Structure formats: C-alpha cells, structure tokens
Paper text:
[name] is targeted from the cytoplasm to the outer mitochondrial membrane (MOM) and is a key player in mitochondrial fission. Similar to previous studies for human dynamin and Arabidopsis thaliana A (AtDrp1A), we designed a fusion protein comprising the [name] domain (G) and the bundle signaling element (BSE, B) of human [name] (the so-called [name] domain - [name] (GG) construct). The stalk (S), which participates in higher-order oligomerization, and the B-insert were replaced by a GSGSGSGS linker, which continued with the C-terminal helix of the BSE. The [name] domain of human [name] consists of a central eight-stranded β-sheet surrounded by seven α-helices and two one-turn helices resembling the [name] core of mammalian dynamin-1.
In the nucleotide-free form, a citrate from the crystallization buffer is bound to the P-loop, mimicking the phosphate moiety of GTP. Apparently, the citrate compensates charges in the active site of [name], while the GMP-PNP occupied active site exhibits a distinct conformation in the P-loop and switch I. In GMP-PNP-[name], the side chain of Arg53 extends to the bulk solvent above the GTP-binding groove, whereas in the nucleotide-free form, this side chain is hydrogen-bonded to Ser40 and Glu43, in a position similar to that of the nucleotide-loaded dynamin complex. This translocation in the nucleotide-free state may be an artificial charge compensation for the negative charge of the P-loop bound citrate. Interestingly, the water molecule in our nucleotide-free [name] GG construct is in the same position as the catalytic water in dynamin-1. This catalytic water connects switch I with switch II via hydrogen bonds to the Thr59 carbonyl oxygen and the Gly149 NH, respectively. The overall root mean square deviation (RMSD) between the nucleotide-free and –bound [name] GG construct is only 0.69 Å for the Cα atoms, indicating almost identical structures. The BSE is formed by the N-terminal helices α1B (residues 4–16) and α1AB, helix α2B (303–323) and the C-terminal helix α3B (708–729, with residues S708GS710 from the artificial linker), arranged in a three-helix bundle with an additional one-turn helix. Both our structures represent the closed conformation of the BSE in relation to the [name] domain, which has been called the “post-fission state”.
Numbering used by the authors: 1 to 327, 703 to 733
Amino acid sequence: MEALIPVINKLQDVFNTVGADIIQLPQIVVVGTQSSGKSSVLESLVGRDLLPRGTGIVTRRPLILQLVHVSQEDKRKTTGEENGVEAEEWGKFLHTKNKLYTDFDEIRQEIENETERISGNNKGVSPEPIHLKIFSPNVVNLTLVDLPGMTKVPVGDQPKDIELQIRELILRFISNPNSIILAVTAANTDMATSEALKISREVDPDGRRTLAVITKLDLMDAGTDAMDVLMGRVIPVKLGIIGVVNRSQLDINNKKSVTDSIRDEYAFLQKKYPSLANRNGTKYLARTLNRLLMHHIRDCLPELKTRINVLAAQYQSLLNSYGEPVDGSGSGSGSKEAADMLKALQGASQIIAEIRET
C-alpha cells in the first residue's frame, strides 16, 4: 500500500508560496494558546528538543512539521564540512532545499533565523509557513501544521492589536473543510472558556472535525482532576479527548529525556486515571494521530485529485480572460500568479499520477 502521507507532504511543498488555501489539502492543524504546552506536544512526538520556546517571546508564522520515519539502518554522513560520525536523525528545510541539518540545535536556530523578522511589509505576522522535514527512526509518520499561539485571555482583554491578526491567521487555516483541528488546552485552566475550543467552534460548531488534547494533567489544583473532561463529559469535541503530561521547562533544562518523561507520564496516568490510562498518553496520541491522518487523507484523495484538475481548467481560462503581453521584462503581477499556479498544479497532478496500484 502506497503511503499517502508522503504524497500530501510533497503537495504541501509544491504549493509553498503559490498559495495552498484554494487546494484545501487534508492536514492536521494545531491550535493552542501561548501557555497550552502545544510546543511540548510537538516535541513529545518528535522525541527531543526542536522548537524555540519563549525565553522572552515566541514564534510568528506557521510551521509545517513533517515527521518522516526511517529504519535505524538509514543514516546520513555528518556535514556541513567535516567527518566522520554518522547521524541517526536529520532535518531538511524547504527554503534551504537539499541542505542537511544534523545538529538539532541548529534546526532550532534556523527556525529562529526564519521566524518573523523585519522582512517585507506591515508587522510581525506572516501566513507563510515554514516547511521542516524531520527524519528519524523514533517518530511515526505524521504531519502537523503548527500555528502561532493565542493569548490565554480574550483578544479584548490584552493590549496588543496584533492579536487580531493571529486570530485571523488561525481562522484562515482551520476554515479549510478538509483540515483536522488539533485543539491544545491545559487542564491547568478552565476548559469551557478555552480560546482554542472557542475559535474552533467558529469553523466547526460541532466537534465533528476537532480533536482535543489535554496537557499538564499534573498541574491541576489540590483535590481536583480531569476525570470528566477525559471521560468526554464536558468538552464537545468528536474526534476524541486525549490527556498527556509532557516535559516542563524545568525538565528540559535538567536535560530529562522524552523516553524518561513518557515513562513518568505512563506512571502518572496509571495512578490517577487507571480506567482511562490505556487511551491516553504520548504514545497513544502519536499513533491515533497517525492512523486518523492516514484514514482522513485517502477519504479526501479522490475529491482532491479532481479539484486539482478542475482548478487547472479554471486557472487556464482565467489567463484567457487576461490577454497580453506575453513578452520580455513584464508579465504583470496577476498573470504571472496564474502562470505560477498552473506550474504548481502541473507538479501536483504529476505527484498524484505517480500513485501506483491501479
């Protein structure tokens, strides 16, 4: 069976700067607040540190994190220059193309060196996603689209006007009918007022395409647990409620391994939620997400294939509606967009066509 996650992965890369919203690609979108621990969720799935936290302040553009599983025998010569130790894990950024990152702290640096910046226009929000492939024998095949974290308070209850732009960005990504919403909220807070769930009901009134992750189960008050939320008694999300306890900042600084953290996570779930421990934790989360993404992709595959063809026809006609000049130094802004789109649509259709097995 041809794995379909690598296929959409390539489709995501194809519509990198030419606009992917109109394609409506099947993908998981991570929506969370700034203090929800959603960045810890990503790293728990990765297996080690990757994302720049907020020593002072956090990220300002989407990160398409593509975890690609490999055999432990599948390795890479360490670069940039000198030898000879061989790497078991490596990363690739789309903007740097075939450059190889063996030092995972250099990957973090590149994310920093690529997030925000006084580039282009307006202020610090770019809906331009960063594309990152992580090759590892410790990850399951999984792709997540990480969006900038919201404020834990409503937008009106904080001073910065740029928070509106963050809310717009998130809505832009999750209004995609074929997008699965991964809403990350800490048990540390009051669930029925979570900004993550609030903004998710605006595009998905029902819980029909939203999955809720409950983090920081070990930080709840005295004499209080997350039994009702984890039993599915309060939060109106339909793809399931999954509770985890990731590494804290203390643990990261104390260099606690993710293997040791999932061990303690496991012990915690067994202790406090014995009747539910089997359907919670990082290991359960990673693989439910893998299967759900696989099932969701092939459901959308037929309708996605024709949409690329239909779009190509509409774009072709749009250029016939356009006219001149076809010549030399200037295309103009709009006609070049249609031309570049058709090129991407061509590359997209080719990728789909290469899917074998009748």
